[PDB]
Amino acid sequence: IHICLIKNGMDHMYHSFDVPKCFMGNPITRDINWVMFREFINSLPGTD
Structure with missing residues (x-):
C-alpha cells in the first residue's frame, strides 16, 4: 500500500495516516x- 501511494504521489497522505x-x-x-x-x-x- 505504501509503495502504491508513493507511485500515486500520496507519500504525504500516507505519512499523515492516523x-x-x-x-x-x-x-x-x-x-x-x-x-x-x-x-x-x-x-x-x-477482490478475487
Whole structure:
C-alpha cells in the first residue's frame, strides 16, 4: 500500500495516516472503538 501511494504521489497522505476519528472514541482521550473495527473488517470487500 505504501509503495502504491508513493507511485500515486500520496507519500504525504500516507505519512499523515492516523486512527480515523470515527474509529477513535474521542480526540482528547486515547480510546478505541474495537467493535466498529471488527464490523469494518468483516465488511471489507476483498477482490478475487
